[PDB]
């Protein structure tokens, strides 16, 4: 609760954790590209007794930040981490996850796509998504493909105990009026992705973004606008 950490409240390097719902967290990481630094968010849920992880921090160093800070701030184990898409922000770390004793897991789409980019390779694979509008479920969240978007392979993940729907970087917070890198993207299909993601998830209270402050189901609606307009460009 209180103010979203922004990259005001993020030395290089370091992590802070944010609290959404009970037993659901953010974590926000910072990364030059370009001359300029961007936040990036993954998601934190506990299960039981230990603690699930959605994405790295993007990269080796945030990624171990990242694991000091959950064992400081929450002093629970995490078990298990998935990434939701193959690029470096979701899986650079996998390596720092791995070596901690975390289960790192992705789709077989998503492990594919990392090889074949020379990136990280999250360990164990998530069966039942290869097909747009499968879901299943993963301890205290269901994940869920909603067909090509930011990249082929890309997840979201839902909380159906707080009611949390972390889009990951499929889905833009509402400051970015222009997309972002689509290098890997559908353009084609990615509304029709968010509207899969809107018809499944109704109930969504909180929405969070790859990058960015959180938002409510707003975001999608705000999402498809973007990527519409760069189609027409
Ligand atoms: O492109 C975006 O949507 C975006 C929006 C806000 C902030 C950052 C990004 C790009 C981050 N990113 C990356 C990324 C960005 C920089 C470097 C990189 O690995 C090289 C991977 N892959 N997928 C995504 S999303
Ligand atoms: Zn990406
Ligand atoms: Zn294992
Ligand atoms: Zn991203």
Redesign the pocket.
Known sequence: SGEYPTVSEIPVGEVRLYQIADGVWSHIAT?S?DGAV?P?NGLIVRDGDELLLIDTAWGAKNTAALLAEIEKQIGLPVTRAVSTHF???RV?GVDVLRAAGVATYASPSTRRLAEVEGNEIPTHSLEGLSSSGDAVRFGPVELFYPGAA?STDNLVVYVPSASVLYGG?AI?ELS?TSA??VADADLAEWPTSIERIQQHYPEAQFVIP???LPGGLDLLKHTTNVVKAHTNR
């Open positions: 990364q590209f961007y990036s690029h470096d922000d650079g930011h970087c833009y970015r972002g890198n790859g990058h960015g």
